Amino acid sequence: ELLDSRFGAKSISTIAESKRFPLHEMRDDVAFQIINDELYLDGNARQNLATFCQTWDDENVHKLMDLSINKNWIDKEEYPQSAAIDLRCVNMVADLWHAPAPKNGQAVGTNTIGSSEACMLGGMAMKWRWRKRMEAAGKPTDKPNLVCGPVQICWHKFARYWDVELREIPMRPGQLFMDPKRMIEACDENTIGVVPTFGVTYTGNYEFPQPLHDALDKFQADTGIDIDMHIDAASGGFLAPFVAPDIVWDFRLPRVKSISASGHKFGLAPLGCGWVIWRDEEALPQELVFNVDYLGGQIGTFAINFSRPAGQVIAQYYEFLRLGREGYTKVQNASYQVAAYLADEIAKLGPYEFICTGRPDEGIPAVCFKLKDGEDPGYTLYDLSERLRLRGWQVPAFTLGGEATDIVVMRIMCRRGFEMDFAELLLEDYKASLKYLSDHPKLQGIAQQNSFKHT
Ligand X SMILES: Cc1ncc(COP(=O)(O)O)c(CN)c1O
Which residues, numbered 353-412, are part of the site for ligand XE (CB under 6 A)? none
Q: How distant is the alpha carbon of residue 133 from its chain centre?
A: 31
Q: Which residue is nearest to ligand XE (CB)?
A: 302
Q: Which does 191 bind (CB under 5 to 8 A by kind): a second copy, ligand XE, ligand X, none?
A: none
- Closest approach of ligand XE to the CB of residue 364, in Å: 27
- From residue 23 to residue 52, the character string flagging contacts with ligand X as x (rule: CB under 6 A) and all else as - is -----------------------------x
Q: 3-class DSSP state for residue 442? A: helix
Please give the angle made by the CA atoms of 220, 207 and 416, to the nearest 5 degrees: 145
Q: 3-class DSSP state for residue 39? A: helix
Amino acid, res. 421: D
Helix, strand and coil content of the chain, in percent to the nearest 5, comes to 40, 15, 45
Instruction: Name the residue nearer to a second copy (CB basis): 271 or 347.
Output: 271
Please give the angle made by the CA atoms of 172, 176 and 181, to the nearest 5 degrees: 85
Q: How many residues bind ligand XE (CB under 6 A)?
A: 3
Is position 232 an interface residue for ligand X (rule: CB under 6 A)?
Answer: yes
In contact, 146 and 183? CB cutoff 8 Å: no
The set of long-range contacts for 151-156, using a CB threshold of 8 Å and a minimum separation of 24, is: 151/195, 151/197, 151/232, 152/115, 152/119, 152/197, 152/201, 152/232, 152/234, 152/454, 152/455, 153/454, 154/115, 154/116, 154/119, 154/120, 155/119, 155/123, 155/195, 155/232
Is position 274 an interface residue for ligand X (rule: CB under 6 A)?
Answer: yes
Q: Is 115 annotated as a binding residue?
A: yes
Q: Which does 201 bind (CB under 5 to 8 A by kind): ligand XE, ligand X, a second copy, none?
A: ligand X
Q: Is 264 annotated as a binding residue?
A: yes
Is position 114 an interface residue for ligand X (rule: CB under 6 A)?
Answer: yes
- Closest approach of ligand XE to the CB of residue 299, in Å: 9
Please give the angle made by the CA atoms of 260, 196 and 285, to the nearest 5 degrees: 50
Is position 115 an interface residue for ligand X (rule: CB under 6 A)?
Answer: yes
- Closest approach of ligand X to the CB of residue 307, in Å: 3
Longest dimension (CA), the chain: 82
Instruction: Name the residue nearer to ligand XE (CB basis): 31 or 288.
Output: 288
Is position 235 an interface residue for ligand X (rule: CB under 6 A)?
Answer: yes
Q: Which residue is nearest to ligand X (CB)?
A: 114
Instruction: Name the residue nearer to ligand XE (CB basis): 52 or 302.
Output: 302
Q: Is 438 annotated as a binding residue?
A: no
Q: Is 72 annotated as a binding residue?
A: yes
Q: Which does 232 bind (CB under 5 to 8 A by kind): ligand X, ligand XE, a second copy, none?
A: ligand X
For the segment 99-128, give every residue that binds ligand XE (CB under 6 A): 108, 110
Please give the angle made by the CA atoms of 114, 119 and 121, to the nearest 5 degrees: 100
Q: How distant is the alpha carbon of residue 203 from its chain centre?
A: 13
Q: Is 440 annotated as a binding residue?
A: no
For the segment 275-314, give every residue that binds ligand XE (CB under 6 A): 302
Residues that bind ligand X (CB under 6 A): 52, 114-116, 119, 152, 154, 197, 199, 201, 232, 234-235, 262, 274, 306-307, 454-455
Annotated binding site for pyridoxal 5'-phosphate: 115-116, 201, 264
